[model samples]
Target: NPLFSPYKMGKFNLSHRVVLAPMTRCRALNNIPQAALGEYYEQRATAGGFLITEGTMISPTSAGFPHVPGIFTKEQVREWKKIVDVVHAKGAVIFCQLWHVGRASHEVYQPAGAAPISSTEKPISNRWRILMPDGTHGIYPKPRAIGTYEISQVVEDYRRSALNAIEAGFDGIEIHGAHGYLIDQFLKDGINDRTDEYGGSLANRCKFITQVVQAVVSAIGADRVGVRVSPAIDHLDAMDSNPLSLGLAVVERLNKIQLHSGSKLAYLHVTAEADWEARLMRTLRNAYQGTFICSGGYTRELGIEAVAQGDADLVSYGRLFISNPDLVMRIKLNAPLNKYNRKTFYTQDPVVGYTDYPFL
Candidate 1:
């Protein structure tokens, strides 16, 4: 089938289009991956298949979710090296997803009880609950609008993080510019009120991420970098008046960068739920000049359909991968998928909903 067919992704050759979506399964203790984390990834890996790791904090201040992986410190890099080795042993190409949650974070998670930093001081709406340390949620906290001078520091963090990822033996790094994270906070006008060069107009709103991508690409080389964006997703109160235009503006800049650098990025991973808005996926896929991978609650039938129709060069699965570690084989043999229990997705347990999932 087309979904199982091999394709070239810049420097890496993929055996199938069924990629493991970069879903955050808060298992890392104190931001360091343990043995169970490697087991989870190993179970899902297939020879020549592609996988993107969960959102990894780029710095101590970048974390919003507890136990998510990090790549900035030597200790963090050491743990990731062990995990990367296990993934490589199974012959899968994995990329670390660089992340910073911006205003989505709170003082409890912040260092020294300091306010979280973002492109604006506006807080996420109270309608959405914050991801607290335990089970209970709390009201969102006001974020400090990052200073113009301080913007350079954030970009530098991304550069060093990219270098750290390379040193950890990852095939590449995917800048988490989606899901109302630091870069998304800048991209959406509804959240970003900055008058600086990082705000106002479409191109300006995209400047922060553009700087991030350029810095990361330059540090690790273009072929070793990819980007994830969700202009259509309004999670955490981050929304644009025109999502299509927002997506296009991003693609335009990425294409220009590809032209200027004389190289292509590994891919541009996009999220548009299957069959929801055809044109959203169609337009962005056509606009981007690099490998295009789409993710959003995809099922096996829809995954095959999208690849056959040329809607995407690849399809990423999230919930299914969580319950069915042998997702590649299940899809290949037209087997039924095990149901995923949403309850344990964020629990602190090491094995309960994680590596304990039975395989076919």
Candidate 2:
């Protein structure tokens, strides 16, 4: 019953503790969210529940792949409004995740085939594939270190995207500071090796995220702002020398941000992998005063137990939500779930593994 119980998140009320974690389906073209994208989210909408969209690019230079959605243009805003309208009509609240891929991107996604921007010039060890005239080719373009003067522009991009999300009728904004993206790149010492105010010490590394949060909070409000942080996630070659300390430091800074409405952030979303311990999760939960949402590989029993045992206020389901649109209903009725097919996950096909999944 803990998972099914109603919970309050900022100004919105969630009917259950199960959240629909954002997953990039790569259905959009030219970075514009298609009408089918609305259907995909609408199918998963549970009355009074929460949903987060895929990592939406804030700028063309920040893009990591083709077909992922963007929130920067007028067309993007218009299309996202359709998706937001459908979700709101179903009584669920949705949040747009503002993202910048940083060094994870390739020259093909950059302007004039230029290198991607990051905290340092160090390129990722793994190569990213791009479709060329000759066919698919994997390339690793060394990134150009972002200068101090350019950092403010990135912050402005985040602010503008947050404003665009509001214009698109989204209930709130979640800054994608996790999973080795731009913000995470700045947070990790292994990736960020600058001599300016943006790197070196943990406080300096954290300055980017805090500045971003401040910019977004200023554009929107603190109660409408949420941040995703993954201390142990090493994706895209982003790993800190001291992850636990980094996590604690980030949380400590977040706790200090107070809104004009006299409240802190809406929630602190933490992605905990399979090996993340319960004690560490509890420490994370206790470090912040706002709502705590824990995500990553969880079963129904484990998710319910997590909330009931005071480890997490909510549990975010990723793949389960992908294969099962009516995930909450399935969990409530104890029905069998459909398995997800990996091959069709990022393809251009609209129905093969997407909306074709049967709902009970």
Candidate 3:
């Protein structure tokens, strides 16, 4: 249907609206992609389809979970290139997602076991648990609020990470500013308690994301940068007082950057739970000047409806893609999808629930 129509995003031409949403697979032991990662993406790739990699750590301090991939090290860049090369061979456009966990992290994932850095010293509530290296779950630890002077370094980390992604042969990079991660920690009022320039005012709460975006854009060019933001998502204890206003403000800030730079971001990816109002999706779709990707619990029918109704330029699938490697083909042929196993999503074994997903 309409989801199969070809569209142009920046300089990339996409043949379908189906996108592989960024997911934390936890298969990258020692923070480097193994051969199985390449096989996984290769299995899912379709000509002219778009794919976004898992939330990749931007620096040594950016990890919140064990076995997640990173972008900074020589080994990381090298292994990612292997993954990228294979995806490219299958002819899909791939974007690396740069991520930082911030307060979502525990010292267990940090360098030398240092406290995780964030916009506040608050720990995530006991309602949520972090996956430890020992294959068990534990409550999140309190994060040390990053000092103002140290903030620039974090921004720089993002910038360099973007450059590294390009070097590794990604078509573009999607900044992970969503899902209660590091950037979300700054944007959401419920998590940020700082009184400094980085917090308090709405604009101040947005400063870190804007700065990081600007730096990454300047390094990689705006056309190669996509941003993912989830103002309506309160996961990881990051809730805004007014999600609508917050979403709008973030768009405005992103627009200002585009205006100043005389270039536009590749896309704006907005995500919200299925229970959230459709108004949230429609407003963001109307607000963004570039391509808009709608994600968060979308099904095959929901994805088709989103594109056909003009609610989003593209729709990303997380779990669906996980279970159905030939997801694009399955959608095209109306084939049944393989059900995903929640128990195996984060297993360290590469084959169990990863590359072994059968095709249509």
lDDT of 1 by residue, 46-84 (tens): 999999999999888898887888899999999999999
Better TM-score candidate (1, 2): 1
Worst 10 residues of 3 by lDDT: 272-281
The alpha-carbon root-mean-square deviation between model 1 and the true structure, to one decimal in Å, is 1.0
lDDT of 2 by residue, 116-138 (tens): 89999998875434443223656
Q: How accurate locally is residue 254 in candidate 3, as Cα lDDT from 0 to 100?
A: 88
How high is each candidate's TM-score?
0.98, 0.96, 0.98
The backbone clash count of each candidate, in order, is 0, 0, 0
Pairs with backbone N, CA or C atoms under 3 Å apart (clashes), candidate 3: none
Clashing pairs in 2: none
lDDT of 3 at 326: 92
